[PDB]
Design a protein around this ligand. Structure first.
Ligand SMILES: C[C@@H](CCC(=O)NCCC[N+](C)(C)CCCS(=O)(=O)[O-])[C@H]1CC[C@@H]2[C@H]3[C@H](O)C[C@@H]4C[C@H](O)CC[C@]4(C)[C@@H]3C[C@H](O)[C@@]21C
Ligand SMILES: C[C@H](CCC(=O)NCCC[N+](C)(C)CCCS(=O)(=O)[O-])[C@H]1CC[C@H]2[C@@H]3[C@H](O)C[C@@H]4C[C@H](O)CC[C@]4(C)[C@H]3C[C@H](O)[C@]12C
Ligand SMILES: C[C@H](CCC(=O)NCCC[N+](C)(C)CCCS(=O)(=O)[O-])[C@H]1CC[C@H]2[C@@H]3[C@H](O)C[C@@H]4C[C@H](O)CC[C@]4(C)[C@H]3C[C@H](O)[C@]12C
Ligand SMILES: C[C@H](CCC(=O)NCCC[N+](C)(C)CCCS(=O)(=O)[O-])[C@H]1CC[C@H]2[C@@H]3[C@H](O)C[C@@H]4C[C@H](O)CC[C@]4(C)[C@H]3C[C@H](O)[C@]12C
Lengths: 204, 212
């Protein structure tokens, strides 16, 4: 659905062979390989590795049998992988050939071409390289989730509160912050600040 | 550079061998079932490791495999370095080999091959956290470690460079020489220095920057 870890897997052909291609959208970072059988199993293995290395929460597919098949679905279920790559594919070849005369198999040409596109910076004015943007982007996503869990954990404590010794206790609202003699709670759509005395907390 | 150190080791399980790359700093493993234990697969597995991640230094376990010639012939293509051999750093990668094994054995009856179980272990170890709400995982620690660097080095390099220049000053309206402060900025009319917990802006006539 919608999760930062979005990738676009696709099959490209060359050398009477097929290269499974993975591309991290937000990043621009790639990671390809030459898969023997373009079956729904070779693609799936390709995910098991990737998913164990980078955080892959969701992927896209170009209908291909080796994609929509339930052969993949198995892994995607195991790893929790809910289920412009075009522009990159060409770029992949743009480099695979130039190096062709420096390696053995095509596979090596394929990887060397990757290594060249990832480290490949964006000029020189503060521009990073896909290998860097991906790491940055994910590093911040980890930090964002961190604060999220941090907030939901604190929400776990519920509060009842009131006003005068003549008012009524309301709630259970969710605790937001606690300090300086007061409690800050979110009653629903309101962020309220109540005196510690006019409040009662309980672990849910 | 701890953010570029990788230890590579080959282990054998119920049949053949497998390559196991470990990012020392985070614990981030990355094993692959290589057919033979030759420096032909090694140089390759290392070629892919370096394209996806930033590899600077390698720490092999001196087995013919990683000592090959067409192995070190690849590192130069990239930018890998290598260092001397050997209870604190040792098991960092071996206490991983059996850690990978202990895991492979729990998903073996679930995988239809060895690789599938090995990866499943790579995946499991890397996503495995260190608690409930707090402790990080190896897959995370590695992005954090690699990311803080990308956005810290070419800015920490400057500070260090300029602070390697010591300075002596005497605060205006007084003639006792304080120093050595560390230099932060040099202008034609004044200097900015960090003494200890102070950042002082000193005129040029009251400072003496030291050559090296
Ligand atoms: C996610 C939280 C962090 C809250 C936190 O962690 N607070 C202490 C909880 C301690 N405990 C749960 C352990 C108590 C359990 C007691 S029990 O008896 O229930 O066991 C953040 C994000 C939104 C909040 C800030 C507001 O937007 C802005 C506001 C401006 C002020 O000028 C000072 C900061 C203040 C009050 C905010 C406080 C705090 O930064 C909040 C709730
Ligand atoms: C046993 C649990 C815990 C506590 C906390 C939530 C409930 C109380 C409210 O907090 C405050 C409320 C104010 C009234 O005036 C009289 C008391 C009353 C009904 C509750 C006493 C009661 O015991 C509950 C179930
Ligand atoms: C990048 C290098 C290292 C930076 C980062 C920290 C220092 C700067 C301060 O941050 C800002 C400060 C503002 C003033 O106007 C004069 C310039 C001054 C002293 C610094 C420029 C200087 O080069 C330093 C050492
Ligand atoms: C012998 C060593 C080396 C020298 C060379 C660099 C040093 C000189 C300072 O740099 C300049 C400074 C100016 C003052 O007015 C009084 C002298 C003073 C403190 C230094 C004399 C001192 O001997 C140092 C450590």
């Amino acid at each position: 659905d919608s999760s930062p870890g979005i990738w676009q897997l696709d099959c490209t052909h060359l050398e009477g062979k097929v290269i499974l291609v993975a591309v991290h959208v937000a990043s621009g970072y790639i990671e390809a390989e030459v898969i023997p059988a373009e079956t729904g199993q070779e693609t799936a293995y390709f995910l098991l590795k990737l998913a164990g290395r980078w955080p892959v929460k969701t992927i896209h597919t170009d209908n291909g049998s080796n994609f929509t098949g339930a052969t993949v679905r198995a892994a995607c279920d195991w790893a929790g992988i809910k289920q412009v790559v075009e522009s990159m594919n060409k770029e992949l070849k743009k480099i695979i050939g130039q190096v062709r005369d420096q390696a053995e198999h095509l596979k090596t040409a394929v990887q060397m071409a990757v290594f060249i596109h990832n480290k490949k910076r964006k000029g020189g004015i503060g521009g990073y390289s896909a290998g860097e943007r991906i790491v940055d982007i994910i590093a911040t996503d980890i930090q964002t989730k961190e604060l999220q869990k941090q907030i939901t954990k604190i929400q776990n404590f519920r509060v009842y509160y009131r006003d005068s010794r003549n008012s009524l206790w309301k709630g259970p609202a969710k605790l937001l912050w606690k300090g300086e003699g007061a409690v800050v709670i979110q009653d629903n759509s309101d962020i309220k600040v109540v005196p510690r005395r006019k409040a009662k907390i309980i672990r849910d």
